[PDB]
A paper describes a structure:
Carboxysomes are anabolic BMCs for autotrophic CO2 fixation found in all cyanobacteria and many proteobacteria. The carboxysome is composed of a polyhedral shell that encapsulates the key CO2-fixation enzyme, ribulose-1,5-bisphosphate carboxylase/oxygenase (Rubisco), and carbonic anhydrase (CA), which dehydrates HCO3− to CO2, the substrate for Rubisco carboxylation. In α-carboxysomes, the disordered linker protein CsoS2 plays an essential role in carboxysome assembly and Rubisco encapsulation. In this work, we synthetically engineer α-carboxysome shells using minimal shell components derived from a chemoautotroph Halothiobacillus (H.) neapolitanus, a model system in the fundamental studies and synthetic engineering, and determine high-resolution cryoEM structures of the shells of variable constituents.
Expression of either construct in Escherichia coli (E. coli) produces assembled shell architectures, while expressing of mini-shell 3 (CsoS1A and CsoS2 without CsoS4A) does not yield any assembly. These results indicate that CsoS1A and CsoS4A together are sufficient to form shell assemblies. CryoEM analysis further establishes an icosahedral architecture for the shell assemblies and reveals that mini-shell 1 assemblies contain mainly small shells (~21 nm, T = 3; see definition of T number is described in Methods), whereas mini-shell 2 products contain mostly large shells (~35 nm, T = 9). Three different sized shells with T = 3, T = 4 and T = 9 icosahedral symmetries are built of essentially the same hexameric CsoS1A and pentameric CsoS4A, which are highly conserved across α-cyanobacteria and many proteobacteria. The RMSDs of the basic assembly units (a.k.a. capsomeres), CsoS1A hexamer and CsoS4A pentamer, in three icosahedral symmetries range 0.180-0.231 Å and 0.240-0.251 Å (calculated from the pairwise comparison of Cα), respectively. All the shell proteins possess the same concave-out orientation, consistent with other shell assemblies. Intriguingly, only T = 9 shells generated from mini-shell 2 contain extra densities not accounted for by CsoS1A and CsoS4A at the inner surface of the shell, which are absent in T = 4 and T = 3 shells. The angles between capsomeres in interfaces 1 and 2 vary slightly among three shells, from 30° to 35° and 30° to 43°, respectively, leading to small curvature changes in the shell assembly, thus the size differences. Despite a large deviation of the tilt angle (from 0° to 43°), the main interactions at the interface between adjacent hexamers, which is mediated by the hydrogen bond network involving Lys29, Ala30, and Arg83, remain largely conserved.
Residue numbers in the entry:
A (entry chain F), D (entry chain C), E (entry chain F), G (entry chain C), H (entry chain C), I (entry chain F), ...: 6 to 97
B (entry chain A), C (entry chain A), F (entry chain A): 1 to 81
């Protein structure tokens, strides 16, 4: 799929928990964890629109209560071709 | 309470708003058994041996006493086969 | 929670007033399985693979905690066969 | 996709903006723009359930703030065959 | 150009005044006046993004004070290909 | 209420906090029957013939009306075989 | 186009959404996403003055409501040649 | 063991003390110490579910009182395979 | 297993009840009951970390309400080699 | 019978009276009188579940009013085999 | 090392936890656990002055919160030869 | 020696002053200065338990009054073998 | 000279001004400008004790009024050899 879901957290433990929740909620691929700086970590998943929607909702619900908590949780079903140049393909 | 194995995830986009954002998992007692859908209150991967609860306990195990759940996963068994 | 397929609609004119105006659907796990009647809280056509809830959750899934329902359809599965 | 997304506005400018937001948000096809009368304009999109969900959410959020406003925003995952006789197949 | 600017007015006199203002403000082509119903009239212009922006702003400023007044004034610089099927090409 | 025999204990470390510290036991009606997990509200050893309760009664039998239990052991039968 | 559009957010999710809104709004190219430090992320777009204006307006309006929020949104119609040495030419 | 224990602190001294408490409490292996940014440091341990539970409890109780404090303390009994690509396998 | 769980009670009846609860809760071995003096009785069990944790929690819950009651209930998943010289191997 | 009845008192006179009441009430055998320390004395009886129930009830009701009082009165219908290693088989 | 570290608790569970904390904290050897009477249990460690200092500090801080509590925590850098006749050399 | 002492400071000047104080207070080896991120600097010293204790106390006393000040000052006399994999051997 | 002068500021402009004041005040050599993180910048000067004293005084007095301000200003007449391994020898 080409839908994009991202979750912003303050700290890495909530980010890992959120990514775990999205990956266990639906058939999405974790394509990157990004250390934004200042304590922000962003986990990005790709998949079908319904799968990404469910994964992002489950991740937000799970990681709302851990660590400094959720900062943002967004779903982009249709990603512009320009935005794909700033989106990671695989994590590291 | 019974012991089922997680098979795969289930996504229902047009589901009632009372279900919240809780994930749904397809579970069976064993491969080949009748399939069932349970609310994932723990977070588990396919192939896990999990502990399930039903009746009215599955409602409050899923988060609220008014939650529309009749089957919820309430734990992962440390050692099962 | 189980996965049933909608077969057809059911109309009961002389039914108790506690059921309100909610539609009734005949559902089964698969063709040939025992038939059951569920409250349609989503709105689905015959042949749909739907998600059903029972017990006391089916009451509040149908609209109210006092609703006379023991089986309610709470979602349509996006991909099932 | 056989899901149906509907947005109703008072005025054609909010309806055009809502249709633009729908089509830019998810992979849905605009199948009809209907003038209901009294200023009511209804735009219809078709696609998968997740795509229609995302498109309707984005269209409502966008058109809430333009023109006389948003009137209705509804999603039907499976449309009855009888109702398909009153749904346009292509816009004009 | 492919930018789109629309102005919604209650009544036809403010619509004609607004269309006149946009057409005299920049190099845009009036591609359609639509009677939405209930007294709503929508005038649509096409052109470059800057020209359409200037034309729409001038039309809104001019027609704010005439008749029942402006209802909506929107600019869509990038129009989706699906929305182009509900946009008139020439007026009548 | 049914009569099951305790087979063995069950430990689920990552279980929801609503279960408290109550022990979990694997029970069946007889050896070879389908296995089930019950909350041990009495305290019994494997091989015991015990009395079990389900539905919403198993919740308050386990300690609280909000307890996530659908099967609780509520007594040991003095004489059974 | 040689105009420059800039949006700064605290967190990567609002920056990604702002870039998506920019690229979907007007004919601008996303030339860079920069991690400034402390959580600050800056997305840059290039294009014509009208296109950059529309893109920046849409991106600000979209990203005002996602993540920790919008920090800055600026348009430079003509960029000095000295400042072009600190501007990225392609994202990564 | 495949369970994951996570503790996040502001500062490296509380993270080192938490890792020491984890390793001294139960039979868990320290697989990573991550500098998140903004002062956030995350230590990860792997082992059995009971061992990880005991280690995380002891580490949180120990690091609650040293440095700027404890931020997060989470246990994941079973980690999804996708999330294993963002988890370090050995510290440095 | 080498995990250690102990329960301190004031009196012997709560100690026997607690030991019964731990032994019926999980697969642990009762390795000693100690009369500390002054009415204190300590029951010690050994096993795996999860089994010992569950047994100790169940024993505390059971014996909280009998006799003078619980005094302490502690779990040591990783026992130091020096402490093993003061821990009984078998009861009497 | 394998059921266990336990009564704990502060002082030996209430324990002797409780044991007398137990043995006179039902068909239970007195298997042990234990000096716990600090004045605590525990008497243990074995028999059938009903016999142990009746004996413990009568012993508690009798010893509530003699000496420093009754501390604990507990019945275990089935005793775990591990706990049988800390239970005396005959008094002394 | 000839320094002596002492911790006294009411109950054996806090004493065991204090001994565990002592042995896990510094390079001290547990030479004795003594039942004083009335519930008092004393654990003794030997080592260098700095090691005994660290061990006693950690043991007190750990056992302050378990069981009936901590009674005494003392360090003797150099023990008189007469007092060495009342100090155990190995635990039992 | 294998004892570990660490001092956390907000800023580098207090960190340098603290490291100077510890190195001039006792025979310890400065094994690493770490920029945690967000302004946190950690200085780590190794040596004997008494030397490390004295060095850490002196460093805390010296650097309490300079810059943003002390954040944490901890001594670990017995370092677990797992924690040694995240501890630097030499500074840079 | 082997004396060390240190000034810490939030921001690079106050650090540059402080370094300029240091070098213009006394005969000290600027040996390093360090980015600590979180906005903290530390400038180091070396020279004789009197020269470093004068330079640090002048630099603090100058940089108190520029940028986000002065954080720390410390003088070390004699630096320990261990601390010389974490001090830069030349700026970059």
């Amino acid at each position: 799929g080409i839908a994009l879901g991202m979750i912003e957290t303050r700290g890495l433990v909530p980010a890992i928990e959120a990514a775990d929740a999205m990956t266990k909620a639906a058939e999405v691929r974790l394509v990157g964890r990004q250390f934004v700086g200042g304590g922000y970590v962003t986990v990005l998943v790709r998949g079908e629109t319904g799968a990404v929607n469910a994964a992002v909702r489950a991740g937000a619900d799970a990681c709302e209560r851990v660590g400094d908590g959720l900062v943002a949780a967004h779903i982009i079903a249709r990603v512009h071709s320009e935005v794909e140049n700033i989106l990671p393909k695989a994590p590291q | 309470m019974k012991i089922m194995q997680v098979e795969k995830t289930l996504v229902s986009t047009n589901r009632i708003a009372d279900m919240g954002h809780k994930p749904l998992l397809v579970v069976w007692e064993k491969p080949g058994a009748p399939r069932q859908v349970a609310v994932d209150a723990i977070g588990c991967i396919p192939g896990d041996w999990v502990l399930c609860v039903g009746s009215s306990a599955a409602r409050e195990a899923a988060g609220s006493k008014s939650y529309p759940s009749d089957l919820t996963i309430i734990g992962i068994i440390d050692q099962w086969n």
